């Protein structure tokens, strides 16, 4: 019985790297100062995991790891490294797959309710390069789908677009096509995401799919359809008959033709038919963030970034991680340690670096303000994620101007093939400091960009 005495891992991540077949899935048991001991384990896995009519077992039988087999290392700061093992589960001759109820009981840690979300920033623990052994392995995005046409992997191009004024509405193709007829940055337009044939939808639900019948201007017109015309149907049982073998003229460009990724009803369900052929249905989410759960007034959401570690198949251009956590009350080892981790002058380390046996694009999102004039800022770790530098259009009120910069899905090509340090992320331009005239809600207390709005006669 009990839970432990099965894994006595007593070494740091170095041992978790040497094994190679260690996959981590669990919740951090860091009891919040203020919340006392009993509730930390009461709401961990006792009532939020499975429901657990009596108890269940796998066909292999005698699995010792139903509970959290915690090898968590706790000597300095309670750095939590806990895994729900998957490699020790049922291993079969040809497929290696377990039964129906095996994964259903243990692997879906649910933080549905517990207060462990006030501030919890989780930086880097990732499945190493030894992942292709008995697993499929996703490492492809739109920067790697049409890669032969000019996109390399890491920050090397994309298909996600910036929109010139007007922001959205009065769809460009009839009259505002000149905004899209500028290959200089108008190249792939998307609309607001909370739309489609949802049960809670307005009268426009008919319009979305109707956008399919107006694809008549992609062949004889001289332009290729690159709008997110929201025609991805809900009911799939129609394509079955004809399109299978030859008539696949629509293409693999799930991020050129529209795709509905709202985060609740679609996910990555495409796994079934396309285990190996087309595992890349792009994470087609319109760029909306910092307005749903991050705000202390409106907190609607949850934390699942640890469990999203398998989701790299989508090619994420947006994930609702949260915020840096700036504001409220500071002091008592003030929360400005974001700067104090690297910007401190009298620090030193001679020996090791960031090498977790399988590095990939990993850089936190620029929130608030981070300009190239603050070159001693955010460019230390990697500086770029699977995104392209695109912020509010405060200084972007011109037709062509610096034509190179506005190339949202093209200047990344040059700015990563230029090969000039981590500055490539902000190699584009630096006048973004004026963009605060448009969007206030990113710099509110520390940066002096809000000083003009209010606060008595001072500048």
């Amino acid at each position: 019985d009990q839970s432990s005495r099965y894994v006595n891992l007593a070494l740091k991540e170095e041992d978790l790297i040497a094994g190679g077949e260690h996959v981590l899935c669990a919740y951090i048991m860091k009891p919040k100062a203020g919340y006392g001991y009993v509730a930390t384990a009461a709401h961990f896995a006792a009532e939020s995991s499975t429901g657990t009519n009596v108890e269940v077992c796998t066909t292999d039988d005698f699995t010792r790891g139903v509970d959290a087999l915690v090898y968590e290392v706790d000597e300095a700061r309670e750095l939590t490294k806990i895994a729900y093992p998957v490699a020790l589960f049922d291993r079969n001759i040809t497929d290696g797959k377990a039964m129906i109820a095996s994964f259903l009981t243990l692997t879906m840690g649910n933080n549905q309710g517990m207060g462990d979300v006030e501030y919890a920033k989780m930086h880097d623990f990732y499945v190493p390069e030894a992942y292709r052994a008995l697993f499929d392995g996703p490492s492809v995005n739109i920067s790697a789908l049409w890669k032969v046409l000019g996109r390399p992997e890491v920050d090397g191009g994309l298909v996600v677009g910036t929109i010139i004024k007007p922001k959205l509405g009065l769809r460009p193709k009839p009259f505002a096509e000149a905004c899209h007829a500028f290959w200089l940055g108008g190249d792939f337009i998307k609309n607001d995401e909370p739309q489609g044939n949802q049960p809670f939808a307005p009268l426009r639900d008919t319009i979305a799919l109707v956008a399919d019948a107006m694809r008549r201007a992609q062949d004889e017109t001289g332009e290729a359809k690159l709008f997110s015309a929201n025609i991805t149907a809900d009911d799939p049982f129609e394509i079955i008959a004809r399109g299978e073998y030859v008539l696949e003229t629509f293409g693999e460009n799930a991020s050129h033709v529209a795709l509905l990724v709202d985060g609740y009803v679609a996910g990555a369900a495409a796994i079934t038919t396309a285990r190996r052929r087309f595992p890349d249905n792009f994470l087609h989410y319109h760029r909306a963030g910092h307005g749903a759960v991050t705000s202390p007034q409106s907190k609607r959401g949850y934390t699942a970034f640890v469990h999203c570690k398998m989701a790299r198949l989508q090619g994420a251009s947006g994930i609702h991680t949260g915020t840096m956590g700036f504001g409220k009350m500071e002091g008592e080892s003030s929360d400005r340690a974001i700067a104090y981790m690297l910007t401190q002058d009298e620090a030193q380390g001679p020996f090791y670096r960031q090498s977790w046996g399988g590095m990939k694009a990993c850089t936190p999102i620029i929130s608030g303000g981070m300009n190239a004039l603050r070159m001693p800022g955010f460019f230390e770790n990697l500086g770029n994620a699977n995104v392209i530098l695109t912020a509010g259009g405060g200084a972007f009120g011109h037709i062509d101007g610096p034509v190179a910069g506005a190339r949202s899905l093209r200047q990344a090509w040059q700015a990563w093939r230029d090969g000039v340090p981590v500055l490539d992320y902000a190699r584009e331009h630096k006048e973004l400091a004026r963009a605060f005239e448009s969007f206030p809600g990113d710099a509110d207390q520390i940066y002096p960009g809000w000083r003009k709005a209010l606060g008595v006669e001072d500048t």
Binding site: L373, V456, T459
Partner: protein, 524 residues
């Protein structure tokens, strides 16, 4: 899509209602008896203030017509906020007078354009009369008095600001502080001030707190990291033979440079102060010339066409005293000629003309204020956050009032001059009868400030208005004493810039709003 149109008074009533609500919100807030209103905040605490325009920003009514009318009349409140902040009360009250008297007497029918032209030329005549009647202000005692008037009849901070004015002259600037001392305090820091401190604690020097206090410093300017420009030992030896220390404005520091400074300052004769760049690149390079002219030197940088490496004893500027803490830096005085200083001042004069509003203007004003004198540091006198904010709002209102009075002169308070000159030029004639009607409506509505002042005092507006009209010159009614009195003797004087701005803005907005014949709303 959902649109509804209402025409004439059918719409007007609703608009009137909303405007009337605004009047109810506003009129009770001014006067010796009036009270200030509290602004709801979901995150934090509602804040008590006199700020009417903020209220209008946060006023909301369920009726679509009324709510949108409130937001569209909010524009004049915002524009009046742009200049002073008080006397916006006067613009609001004259707007209520306009709407009330006009809409109750004209009953539409007549031409809004002719009425607007008449009131516009009447406004022009009132502007002329106000310019003619403006009385200059000379004594700083009257300056303190008018600041107190702007300070809601509060004298201690007013005389504090007056003494600050005496110390710093016209060019001096002030600071705003949060939760510092809870009681009034005023000091002045003279000379140039830098938003940096010494990077290495190893620079503990003779003054306490480990500060760096050096007489006759020698300045060095650098926009690069110095490794081989370590070969300044001729200049370094010249400084050592001079007997006075030197200061470094290097942009970046080599590890060898930092180490050699640490070792040679600890035991030696050359104690040097080294600090990082003050701020952003643009303003830094702009104020490099300010430093050069202040110390009488020339800017030392590689990206200019003098020399990248060479340096002489005359290349560096000379100063009197530097006092530096771990966070803040100050240079008391530098050895610079007045000729080049005012030449830079002259080029800054053309620099003053700009339309960027924020950013460059604020830094240029700050750097020039330090170029001329010093900055006034203050500890606010108040117990709570709202009290501090109200005190600071009164302080800035007093500052604006002093500026406008010094540049323009003063007039008798209560708008009595306005109604007096309106009586003086009552014979104004227009193009047609409608224009004369507009002229007469405007002159009658100009009484609104005093009418509301009397009404708020719990006294009959008509009686006191008639008595004041009987009074002449600088004699009239003191509302604070609820008796008679001379405005000069009571010291209630108003700079006229705010009056002119408010009257122009309110006249324009009333003239545009009166011409309405249809109103459009969105339906739920």
């Amino acid at each position: 899509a959902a649109k509804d149109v209402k025409f004439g008074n059918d719409a007007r009533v609703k608009m009137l209602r909303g405007v009337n609500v605004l009047a109810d919100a506003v009129k009770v807030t001014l006067g010796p008896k009036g009270r200030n209103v509290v602004l709801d905040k979901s995150f934090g605490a509602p804040t008590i203030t006199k700020d009417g325009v903020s209220v209008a920003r946060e006023i909301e009514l369920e009726d679509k017509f009324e709510n949108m009318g409130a937001q569209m009349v909010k524009e004049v409140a915002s524009k009046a906020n742009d200049a002073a902040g008080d006397g916006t009360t006067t613009a609001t009250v004259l707007a209520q007078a306009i709407i009330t008297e006009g809409l109750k007497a004209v009953a539409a029918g007549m031409n809004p354009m002719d009425l607007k032209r008449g009131i516009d030329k009447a406004v022009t005549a009132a502007v002329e009369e106000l310019k003619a009647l403006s009385v200059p202000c000379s004594d700083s005692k009257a300056i303190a008095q008018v600041g107190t008037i702007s300070a809601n009849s509060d004298e201690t901070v007013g005389k504090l600001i007056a003494e600050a004015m005496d110390k710093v002259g016209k060019e001096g600037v002030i600071t705003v502080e949060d939760g510092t001392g809870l009681q009034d305090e005023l000091d002045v820091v003279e000379g140039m001030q830098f938003d940096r401190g010494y990077l290495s604690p190893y620079f503990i020097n003779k003054p306490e707190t480990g500060a760096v206090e050096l007489e006759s410093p020698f300045i060095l300017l650098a926009d690069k990291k110095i490794s081989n420009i370590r070969e300044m030992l001729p200049v370094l030896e010249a400084v050592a033979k001079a007997g006075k220390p030197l200061l470094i404005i290097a942009e970046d520091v080599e590890g060898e440079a930092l180490a050699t400074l640490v070792v040679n300052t600890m035991r030696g004769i050359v104690k040097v102060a080294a600090v990082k760049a003050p701020g952003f690149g643009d303003r830094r390079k702009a104020m490099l010339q300010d430093i050069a002219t202040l110390t009488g030197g020339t800017v030392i940088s590689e990206e200019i066409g003098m020399e990248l490496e060479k340096a002489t004893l005359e290349d560096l500027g000379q100063a009197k005293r530097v006092v530096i803490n771990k966070d803040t830096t100050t240079i008391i005085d530098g050895v610079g000629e007045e000729a080049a200083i005012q030449g830079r001042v002259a080029q800054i004069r053309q620099q003053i003309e700009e339309a960027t509003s924020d950013y460059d203007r604020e830094k240029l004003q700050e750097r020039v204020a330090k170029l001329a004198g010093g900055v006034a540091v203050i500890k606010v006198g108040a117990a709570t956050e709202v009290e501090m904010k109200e005190k600071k709002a009164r302080v800035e209102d007093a500052l604006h009032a002093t500026r406008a009075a010094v540049e323009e002169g003063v007039v008798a308070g209560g708008g009595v001059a306005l109604i007096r000159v309106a009586s003086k030029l009552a014979d104004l004639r227009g193009q047609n009868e409608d224009q004369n009607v507009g002229i007469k409506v405007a002159l009658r509505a100009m009484e609104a400030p005093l009418r509301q002042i009397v009404l708020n005092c719990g006294e009959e507006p008509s009686v006191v208005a008639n008595t004041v009209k009987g009074g002449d010159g600088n004699y009239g009614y003191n509302a604070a004493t609820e008796e008679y009195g001379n405005m000069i003797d009571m010291g209630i004087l108003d700079p006229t810039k705010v009056t002119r701005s408010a009257l122009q803005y309110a006249a324009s907005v009333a003239g545009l709003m009166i011409t309405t014949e249809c109103m459009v709303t969105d339906l739920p």
